[PDB]
Structure formats: C-alpha cells, structure tokens
From a paper:
Type IV-A CRISPR-Cas systems diverge from this general mechanism, using a nuclease-independent interference pathway to suppress gene expression for gene regulation and plasmid competition. Here, we present several cryo-EM structures of two evolutionary distant type IV-A1 and type IV-A3 complexes (from Pseudomonas oleovorans and Klebsiella pneumoniae, respectively) bound to cognate DNA targets with and without DinG. The structures reveal multisubunit DNA-surveillance complexes that intimately recognize their DNA-targets to form an R-loop structure. Our results support a model in which DNA-binding is achieved analogously to type I Cascade, while recruitment of DinG differs mechanistically, even in closely related subtypes.
Five Cas7 subunits assemble a helical filament along the crRNA spine in type IV-A1, while six subunits form the Cas7-backbone in type IV-A3. In type IV-A1, the finger domain of Cas7.1 stabilizes the bipartite PAM interface while stacking against Cas5’s thumb motif and the Znf domain of Cas8. Cas8 inserts a short α-helix (α3) into the minor groove, with lysine 75 positioned near the A-T PAM base pairs at positions 1 and 2. On the opposite side, phenylalanine 51 aligns to the 5-methyl groups of the thymines in TS positions 1 and 2 of the PAM, stabilized by a short loop extending from the Cas5 thumb. Similarly, type IV-A1 Cas8 inserts a loop to stack the wedge residue threonine 120 against the PAM base pair in position 0. To deflect the TS for crRNA-mediated sequence interrogation, serine 119 of Cas8 and lysine 117 of Cas5 clamp the rotated phosphate that connects the PAM and dG1 of the TS. At the head of the type IV-A1 effector complex, Cas6 is recruited through its N-terminal RRM1 to the thumb of Cas7.4. Remarkably, the recruitment of Cas6 in this position caps the crRNA:TS hybrid by aligning the RRM domains via threonine 224 and histidine 225 against the terminal base pair formed between dG-28 (TS) and C28 (crRNA). In our P. oleovorans type IV-A1 structure, we could trace the single stranded NTS from the PAM to nucleotide 6, while the remaining NTS nucleotides were not visible, likely due to their flexibility.
Residue numbers in the entry:
A (entry chain D): 1 to 220, 235 to 345
B (entry chain M): 1 to 229
C (entry chain B): 175 to 222, 236 to 345
D (entry chain C): 175 to 222, 237 to 345
Write the structure that this text describes.
RNA sequence: GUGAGCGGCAUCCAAGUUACGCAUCAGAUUCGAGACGCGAGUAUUUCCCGCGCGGG
C-alpha cells in the first residue's frame, strides 16, 4: 500500500554522518594540513545516480535522512501518541521486556533462532502495531516498508520521479553551522561575580591555574577543558522532501494507525539538533495509493473514515497480552 | 619562529617597571632557577646578559604582558606562567587574576612596496658620551635607522629567522617626546620620543621590538595587529 | 569464485490466513508442519530421520569473462566429417558447456575457430571459401543419411 | 555505499516518570534494567547475553543504477512464455532482495527484450507479438488443476 | 649366438539435476565568534657587560 508524504522542514535537518571530518575556517571540507582545521560533523548523505542535464548517469552524494531514523520516528509517534494512551486508558502495563520489544523491536541482542507457530505468526501480523514492524525474539516480518527521506532535488529525480518536479531545487542544500564553547570561569572578571562559588576568587584562580598547568603541553587527553570551536553541517531550511511508505497487504486497523501517526507526526522532530530546535517539519501532502487524502486539518475525509473507525475499534479492545506474547522468549 | 604572549588581567592597569619589580619580589620566594631564567640573570648573579634578552615584559589595558621571543624564551614563558599566576593569586586575594595564552607565528618578508610602521615609544640615548653623538638630529637620524636595523637583525638572529638582505629602513617623523627612567632611584631620564613613524621595505609579521634594554618593555610594537599602509 | 546458495522452508514465510488458504487443511496443516520442524530441529541439536528444507551451502564456479582454448583433433577425416564438425561449431554457442541449468551457467560465445592453423571464423560463423567443400560434402551426406547405418551399428551379434 | 545503522536502548531514552508509567514496576524496573546494564558493561570491559545498544554498518548498491536480467528458456510452449510475461508484468510489485524494513530492492523495468524484439510498453508487456502468449497462458490457467502439483510432489517411494 | 630372438592394454562413456542471505535495529545526547596591544612619566649620569665606540 503506497504512501507518499510530502515534508517541508521549517528548521534545518541535522542527521550526523558517522566519522570525524575536519573543516577549515573558510568552509573548505577536509582542508590540507598546515592551516587551522576544526572538526566538522557532516550531514548524512547517500550517493545516488543522477543526470546533471548532460544525459549521462553519475553517482552524486544526496543529503538524506536515513530510512531507519524515519521508521523509528513513525514507531515512536505511534507508541507515544496512539498506543500508549490507549493502554493507559485501560490501565494496562507492559513488562520491561515488552516495552523494550515495542520500542526497539527486541529486548535483548540474542535472537531466539527458532521459528514461531503459524497461529502466533498470524496473531502478531494481524496486530495493529506488531504486525507493522515485527521483530521480537523469533524474528517476524513486519508489513512496513519505510524508506528514507529524499529531498526533492535534481539529483533525486532518477529515484523519486518527475511528479514533484515543481518543488525541485538545483543548487546545494547544505550549510556549515559554527558552534563554540566559552569557559564559564574565563568570563569572571570581578570578585562579586563569583560570590556563589565555594571560596570565590581562590577557587577560580586555582581552577585557572590547573587549566594553565594542563595547557603547558603543546607537543611531544584526560581533562580536555570547557573550550571548543567546531562546526556541523545541516541541510538548509525550507527544502521539500518526499517520504515513501509501502505496506504489505494491511488491514484497515493498521492503515488507520499509520494515518493517526501521520496526523501526529509533526509533533516530533525528525533527527538531531534537539538542543538547537533542529528537525521541525510540516506535512504538506499525504498521498494514499495515488490519491491525496491530506486536508488542512490533517488526514480526514470520507476516503479514510473506515481506516480511522477500524483503528479506533482495535484500540478500544487492545490489551498488553499481545505484546507480552510477542516479547516472550521461547528458549 | 614562535613568540609567546601572555596577558595577566590584574584588574587595575599596571606600570611596566612597577610590574617588573613586583614580579621580581614575588619570584624571589619561588625556585631561584626560574627566577634567574625569567629576569635573564646568570645563575648566582644579577647581571644583565650581553646576548639579546628573549623574555621581556610589556603593558596591557588591565595588567602586564609577557613577551617571550624565540623558541627558548617561548618555552620559558610557557612553563613559567603557572607559578607566576599562582603567586599573583596569593598576593592579591581581593581580585581574580585571569590568563589567556596567545602563541603567535613570527616571520618577516620583503616586498617592493614601502611599508610604513608606527612605534608609540622610542628610546635613543644611554650615555652622555653617546648623547654627545645625539647632540643634534643630524647625527641622530643615522643613529635612528641604524638602531632599528640592528634591533631587527639581533632579534632575527636570536630567533633564527632569515631576514631580507636588501632592507632599507627610513625614519619618517615625530609627534611627541617623553622620558625613559631605568630605576626609581636613578635621577637620569633617557631620551624618549612619542608617535614615531618610519618606512621599511618589508612586511613585518608577529611582534618586533626596537630601542634599548629589552628587559623592561618599552619600545615595543605589534606588526600583526597594526595592519599596514 | 565461490557462490553461496540458500533454501528456505516455504511454510515459514506464511503470515496471513490468506496465504494458507490454498493449502489443504490450512492453518492446522501449517501448524503441524512447523511443530514437526521444531521437534526435528530439537532432536538433531540434541543428538549432536528426514531432512528439512532449510539449506545453506556453496558451490565454486569459474568467473565469467575468461577465455578458454578448445582443441579438437580428427584422425584423417573425410570432408563430410569435417563439415559436420564445422556445423556443430556453428550451432555450438546455443548449447551450454557444463552444469548449472537453473543459474544459467555455462553460457559462452565462440571468438575464433582455427582450422589447421588458419582462421575460418567470421562474424556470421564458420564460413569462407576454404570451408565450402566441407559444407557441401556434409550436406550431401545428410541428404543421403538414413537410419540403416545407425540400426546396423547398434545391433548386437548375440 | 555504506549505510550506518544504530540500535538504541529504550530505557536509556526513558527519562520521565510518565514514560515509565506504562512499565510494570514503574521506576524500579527501569532502574534495575539500567543498573544491570551498567554491571554487565563493566564486567565485559574488565574481562576484555548481549545488550540492546548497537552500532553496525551494511553495504548497499546505490539507487539509480541500471541492471540487465537475462532469462533463457529452452524450447518453451506458448503457455510458459505467457506465464513468464505475466510475471514480468507484475514483477515490479515485489522487491528484489533484502532490506524489507528499509524498503530496499524497489525497481522499475525500463525495457523487456523478447528474442531481440522490445515488447515493453508504458503499460507493461503489450502488443500483437505477445497476444498469443497471453491467450495461451489464460487458457492454461482456466484449465489449471491441482492434480499436476499433487502428482509432482508425491514421492515415488 | 644374455631360456635368447619376435609382440600397442587398446578401443567406447555428460557429474548432472533441484534450492531467496533473509528477517529485526534513531548517529543520538551537551556547549556565546566574542574577547584581546600601551598618550603609564625629567634632563644628563651609577654601579658595569663587551675591550675611542657598541649597552642594564
């Protein structure tokens, strides 16, 4: 069941790429040695094949949000906003292992290794939540195919298509954001400022003396010190994305659950930058098998009323027993 | 090619000579080796060395500045700041002393363009027999650029930095005059000129110095922060 | 190069009653199959007699794109036999060298056919003026060929 | 290309009393979980069951590359070619290999070449050249009974 | 003139058929580009470092 969600972020998206990269003071990524080189936390990118207008195909890096991040965003939205209140209304409690399995697909790092009975498989795959995601001790195939978040760009046209060619952007969509860290004590300049510190002037002078003592070593660790000037790379604000969700033969309850999550999806940030309010997005269109079911009030209309009715009926009869059975280890 | 500059924020703006005396009194308590190393005194004596002094002093908006020329003087300043900072903290418990370290790169290069430099304070007289040569500006001017070139060569040799062999420094003019006083007990005031400007055929980097008796902090000027003309 | 091959138990990929609807018995049959599989797996793990459908093994293959030399010698043949060999070479690329039918192994293309030190291979196939006599002779032999020779050859004296 | 995958521990991200309100035992269970995790981590580090936290990588072929799939059949009937073309009409509805959770394996067919002839239209395999195959397979399916499958699967011993 | 001399183990034969590396998993949590260059001190010589002159 194809779902295509058009997402425009009103704040920069910061999905940090693993690894240590360095940037000069003028934005040169991986500058030659000798000049100042500050660490740079790059934004996640995926190399994709694209045409730049010359008719030939080449692999180009495209800044994306990883699909596993978006899948976990959907899972957390569904749980924290739809299923957790439903369980609390019945005053149902999930065990610690069941909670871990619901929030991360499994409770331990060791798989069971044995298959599940067909009755258990159908019971879990018919469940509104566990059917979508799956996992557990005896690994179960979920019905959810959550893809990555692809910006509507000239580089992703070979992937997403040309349906959204009106929202495309030709240039780069990333920017270096410089962060700092000044020492708190280094800002103290008057005796009355440090009246709260134990000993005040004596303690501050001792601490800065220790800083000077650990700073004397230049060339030939522990206690680096509260001082830094680094940078990170963010996908610039305003860029329109495409999120594609495919579901393998769902019941109406599962579709209603997904639609509820999409309704409440904008209440959770996409990825990273919590401290800096990064990852804020608004859903601009939701397409359900080629039809636009998005209204200014969210997913509504008679085209989706049966899904909402089914998910409401399923939630009104939802118990922790299914989660406990799903998370139970058979070894 | 490194000159280590250290700034101490006493809180109250400090005289150069008074700061020198105060730190010398403070250093006198601590390990004598660092003491004699800091004020360029031969171990066991108190004589000013003939060779180009590498560790010197200087003023600041809220304290005094350490200027350690060369690699050796820079290292001496680097391992001497914690002790002097601790001593300053002990001596003034009524104010918080704060230290930031600025390690600069020293270099000098020649360009066909004529670069104009300004020096705030200048000293050009040590002895009256030398003042007999200073009796008039006719002999004074040659002494002026001679002193500038000699100081530049001395510091370049001390830090081991090759210097443009085709340099031509030219003094331009004067604005004000002051007096240079070596010791509080000394009645003699040496020659002092303010607002001195001169032209040099080289782009000066880092911090350079000119004058006499480097061990106090007069006649200093930062070429890096002064930009150029 | 080494290629890894897997086999899966189809009943383990059932996830809805719709998939088991085509199976006679359905969910009961699937449950019985899975229970028997679990019991057999536990017995085999403990012992360390039917075998299941789960398999993971490998087979080793010669990488694709490598050139081979094939040498065929014939002991003083008539022109009909040379023509027959040439026809087989012309229609040989449609065949496949060795096993691996499922994975489409053994596919090849003939690049050059050398006939007594001379190249007789064209883009079309074995052709040229030097091979005309062989092709004419084999065409005549095919026209005159009958089952009598095969029947006499295959007949047993006793 | 290399994709970096991470697994979090839900309890570590659990940092509000309302978040633990759904867990049996409340804060006590989460505290026991965290302290047991700490003890296991310290024991494992000192030593020199596995927890939930993970950091891995999986390597994928980039999106947008074209592939050539060669299917050969030796002396097929019309019904078998029709079945193959029917499967190729509905082949894009299924993924190639791996990454079900992350929607990997999705593809689109650019062209289908049928013994040197291109039989791919924008709406699938269509044309007069393929009509007889589709008709034959439709008739065969209308005459398809399970007896062939049962006879095929029955062991001879 | 060795119980010597003389003497083809040779012909013919497919290792092939069948088999999903797959299911599950937040790159996340913290931190200021804003601070730092002197208008600081009198008149003509005093103990001395290199040796008339360089220089505490």
């Amino acid at each position: 069941m194809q779902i295509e969600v058009l997402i425009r972020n009103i704040t920069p998206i910061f999905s940090a790429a693993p690894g240590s990269y360095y940037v000069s003071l003028d934005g040169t990524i991986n500058p030659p040695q000798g000049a100042s080189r500050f660490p740079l936390t790059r934004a996640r990118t995926m190399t994709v094949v694209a045409e730049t207008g010359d008719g030939v195909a080449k692999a180009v890096p495209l800044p994306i949000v990883p699909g596993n991040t978006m899948r976990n965003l959907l899972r957390r939205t569904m749980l924290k906003d739809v299923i957790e209140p439903a369980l609390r209304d019945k005053s149902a409690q999930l065990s610690i292992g069941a909670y871990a399995t619901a929030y991360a697909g499994n409770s331990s790092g060791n798989p069971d290794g044995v298959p599940s009975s067909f009755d258990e498989i159908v019971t879990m795959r018919a469940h509104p939540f566990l059917g979508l995601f799956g996992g557990g001790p005896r690994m179960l195939q979920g019905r959810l195919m959550v893809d990555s978040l692809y910006p509507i760009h000239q580089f992703s046209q070979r992937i997403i298509g040309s349906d959204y060619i009106n929202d495309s952007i030709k240039g780069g969509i990333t920017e270096i954001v410089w962060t700092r860290r000044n020492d708190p004590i280094l800002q103290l300049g008057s005796p009355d400022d440090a009246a709260v510190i134990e000993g005040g002037a004596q303690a501050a002078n001792d601490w800065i003396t220790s800083l000077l003592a650990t700073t004397k070593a230049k060339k030939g660790d522990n206690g680096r010190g509260l001082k830094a000037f680094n940078a990170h790379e963010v996908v610039i604000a305003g860029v329109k994305w495409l999120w594609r969700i495919n579901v393998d033969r769902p019941s109406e309850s599962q579709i209603g659950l997904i639609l509820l999550a999409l309704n409440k999806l904008a209440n959770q940030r996409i990825a990273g930058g919590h401290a800096k309010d990064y990852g804020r997005f608004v859903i601009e269109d939701v397409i359900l098998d080629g039809e636009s079911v998005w209204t200014p009030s969210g997913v509504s209309g008679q085209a989706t009323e049966q899904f909402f009715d089914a998910i409401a009926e399923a939630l009104d009869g939802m118990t922790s027993s299914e989660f406990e059975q799903f998370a139970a280890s058979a070894k | 090619m490194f000159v280590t500059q250290v700034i101490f924020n006493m809180g109250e703006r400090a005289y150069p000579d008074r700061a020198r005396a105060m730190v010398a009194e403070l250093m006198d308590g601590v390990q004598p080796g660092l003491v004699a190393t800091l004020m360029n005194y031969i171990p066991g004596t108190s004589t000013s060395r003939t060779e180009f002094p590498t560790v010197q002093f200087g003023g600041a908006s809220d304290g005094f500045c350490l200027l350690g020329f060369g690699d050796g003087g820079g290292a001496i300043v680097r391992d001497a700041v914690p002790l002097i900072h601790a001593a300053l903290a002990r001596r003034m418990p009524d104010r918080i002393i704060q230290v930031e370290h600025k390690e600069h790169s020293l270099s000098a290069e020649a360009r066909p363009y004529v670069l104009s430099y300004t020096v705030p304070r200048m000293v050009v007289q040590k002895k009256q027999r030398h003042a007999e040569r200073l009796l008039h500006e006719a002999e004074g001017k040659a002494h002026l650029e001679g002193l500038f070139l000699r100081s530049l060569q001395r510091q370049a040799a001390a830090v081991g930095l090759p210097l443009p062999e085709n340099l031509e420094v030219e003094f331009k003019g004067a604005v004000g005059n002051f007096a240079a006083k070596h010791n509080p007990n000394s009645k003699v005031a040496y020659r002092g000129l303010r607002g001195a400007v001169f032209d040099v055929n080289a782009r000066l980097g880092g911090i350079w110095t000119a004058g006499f008796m480097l061990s106090k902090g007069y006649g200093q000027f930062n070429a890096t922060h002064q930009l150029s003309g | 190069e080494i290629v890894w091959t897997r086999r899966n138990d189809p009943i383990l990929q059932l996830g809805s009653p719709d998939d088991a609807a085509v199976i006679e018995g359905g969910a009961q049959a699937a449950n019985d199959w899975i229970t028997s599989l679990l019991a057999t797996t536990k017995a085999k793990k403990g012992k360390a007699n039917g075998r299941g459908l789960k398999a993971f093994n490998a087979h080793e293959v010669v990488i694709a794109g490598v050139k081979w030399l094939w040498r065929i010698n014939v002991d003083r043949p008539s022109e009909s036999q040379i023509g027959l060999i040439l026809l087989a070479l012309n229609k040989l690329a449609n065949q496949r060298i060795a096993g691996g039918h499922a994975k489409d192994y053994g596919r090849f293309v003939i690049e050059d056919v050398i006939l007594d030190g001379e190249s007789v291979w064209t883009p079309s196939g074995v052709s040229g003026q030097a091979t005309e006599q062989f092709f004419d002779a084999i065409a005549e032999a095919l026209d005159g060929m009958t089952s009598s020779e095969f029947e006499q050859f295959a007949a047993s004296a006793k």
